[PDB]
Symmetry: D3
Subunit: 177 residues, 6 copies
């Protein structure tokens, strides 16, 4: 089976109010050893947010702002990009690359189950031993249509026909790990 986000996520996830200071955030991250805090929703409809080590370094430290006067609402992402627990890790990897984030809460319904990061992916993903190309199932469909057309046009016993079907088979082998 495809390895899922919830199988590699960090389960220790702490939350903080958006009204807290950045100093409060930094203290919590130091005590708990955390590179990201989830911002508590204030009510059922209110979205999840996140504040991360990079937010704090780029937006506070890099200008020399006083973390005791800045607040989490001034530097958090809210709404933040979120991850389904069933989502395959290769998709998380990609969501992360496309949106340029390194971590996200894992949410199922409106319940917070954990937090998943690039480090989680590097350290616990099966991607070295089971690399599987994204959208391969869509590739398989397309390569079958191509193969069917080449064989109709050039003949069932032509080198180009046999080549096109070989593509269908290398892909199907690749999709079954």
């Amino acid at each position: 089976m495809v390895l899922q986000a919830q199988e590699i996520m960090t389960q220790n996830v702490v939350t903080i109010r958006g009204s807290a200071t950045v100093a409060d955030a930094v203290k919590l991250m130091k005590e708990k050893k955390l590179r990201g805090l989830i911002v508590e929703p204030r009510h059922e409809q209110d979205p999840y947010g996140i504040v991360t080590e990079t937010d704090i370094v780029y937006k506070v430290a890099a200008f020399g702002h006083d973390p005791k006067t800045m607040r989490v609402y001034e530097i958090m992402a809210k709404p933040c990009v979120v991850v389904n627990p069933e989502l395959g890790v290769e998709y998380v990897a990609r969501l992360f690359a496309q949106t340029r984030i390194r971590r996200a809460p894992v949410i199922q319904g409106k319940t917070l189950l954990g937090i998943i990061s690039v480090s989680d992916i590097l350290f616990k993903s099966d991607f070295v031993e089971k690399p599987k190309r994204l959208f391969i199932e869509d590739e398989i469909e397309a390569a079958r249509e191509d193969a069917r057309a080449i064989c109709a046009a050039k003949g069932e016993t032509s080198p180009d026909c046999a080549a096109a079907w070989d593509v269908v088979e290398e892909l199907q082998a690749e999709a079954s790990h």
Copy 2:
């Protein structure tokens, strides 16, 4: 209930396409149905939603002169794509969009596709002209009260600085009701 939600302003006519379709098939569907975005069908329970938009097609195919009859949707779609909760307030959708630099997203609840929401939807149907509320003002109010409580403890409960800090709490609270009205 009070804040206008994504589902109240989304476009409900949402069409999907397979990732294996050609870009030409995508363009034909968008022209027939008059659509600036197609949702890519999930292949199974776990598989995420994706999107292909007018800009994907123009920037990745038209601008190079690629043949839409040989490219496929999987070559230019975003998958996973950023998604929007139906309960999310429109001011938050506006912000999600600004932070992620997108102009449209599917509205998804659980794994069910309810619609599609865009910057146009926001411009044409949001209540932001008549009910403007600054984002996180409620968090500002909490912080200004903590600041005020600290300044009064430090400088004395009858000090000009104490009364000033509470006046900031009150200008903010006036601002938060003026618009909750």
Copy 3:
């Protein structure tokens, strides 16, 4: 004449607004006329065209919760804005748009505003599905002929490498006509 031009696919209904108007006035006009972009009127002969678009309004006003009744168009417009020649081929418009990361621009000839052209206009009305031509293929052909001429001079006019280099010139020239048809 052969290549489909910007003016043949542009939207002709183009409305303008003053830079001094409020964002609320802009939003009202866009809603009445159903428009995703307003052109900002030049104040005099030399003054450039500007644009304010649905995204400017959503990203700069809605996403922060600013009051559109107190902000002004000059605070969120692009001026000068990128402009499009009416004679420009649509594949070039597609590319200008990709390189500059915009989705719409006024079509201007001299200082006269003829219309407005967008990615939607391109998606819905461009001939790129049926007449795909790779950009700068004609420049590729010239370069491949220079390469071919050099390889033949260096390795001999009857050499496999000479005949191969000219075969590249011919596959390209076949590709450039297949679509000029």
Copy 4:
């Protein structure tokens, strides 16, 4: 009067074919001492393009590509952003900041008149001695409407009325250099 692009542009502008090699481009730039070449339109409808020192350094030198095999069409901007000769330099400065370019051809109709750059602006603009805020005329209109409203509401002889008109006057003074 507002200083215009054509008054500060470089008039020595050389062109090159898009089919030329990057080595040809580099040779021409070295002989003529130029940080940008205009790409010749091939016919009346064909847009102007540009290739600049940065294109060459970022796209060829930084990867170690052979300038003798790469071509100008592979690294040029075409269409390129263009400048009207009548456009005020403060607007050129801004067009440049918004589009993140440092140079553009000056075109009137379809005739190439010159080339204008950030250096041209730094060295020949009047911006140190006559800095003029962009869209001030639009600001003036808005400040008059504000002033008219405050005086109607609070009275013609109120401090807030006199303050609002003082804004109208500081702006009008600023717009006349």
Copy 5:
């Protein structure tokens, strides 16, 4: 201490290197065994610059496309040259260098010797910025406010309200720069 905290005082000292010719699988294996979010790429000779490959390079460039780490090589995804950090550089400057260049980690180099590796985590966990916040370029602000003050006093007189005001700006700033 009262001095500005320096990069070398907060850097991670356990720094491992890899050749640019190694596979990404070799890189991933090393990072897993040693528990590391970044490897320094060995310079091949005196002139050759340092490089870096990081957890994000690997996830964004290899995992997210489904490339085979056993066939890709570190030279295909590393930054070389990479941005490098002086050991004497103040952490608030490292924070800024990081923001301006959009990186999250860099080698600490003195001459051509590798001393360690410094990251945003190092900054979050070990910087003194909570207890000693100092605005960037306040020292430059102080110099400018002194030049302004000197000029106003020369022009308007050394005992003038405007002179005393301008020096009061110099003093509020100097108080802000210390503690």
Copy 6:
């Protein structure tokens, strides 16, 4: 010469500095008199990093908004720390450092001494990349192709077609890296 051309061989040697506390007008005046597209910002002390302010900083951040250069200061628009260049660094690496960090000019620093200033123009006008083009990290490619070659020969025999093929890859690459 045959060696890789270094930053110090193509840098501009006329390099002027300015304090961060100076006005942008002072900066503009200096750049006009000396004919310069960039000024180096003086470090205030041993630990303090180098900075830079460039023609683009001034045009994009001051001119384009209509700010008064007589009231703005260099610290409000400079990069500090700025990316810096070793004098021994090869120009193809400078070109790359520039692309990766999105800058067009940098100081050349050896230790804490300022030797000059190097820019994209310097690279365009004085680089040997037309006559000596070398692909970046080809040396790393060569190392990898030798490891591959060594393995194929150990596995399949030293006289096997596959062995001779793998070494032929090593030789085409080595020819490409020279002349």
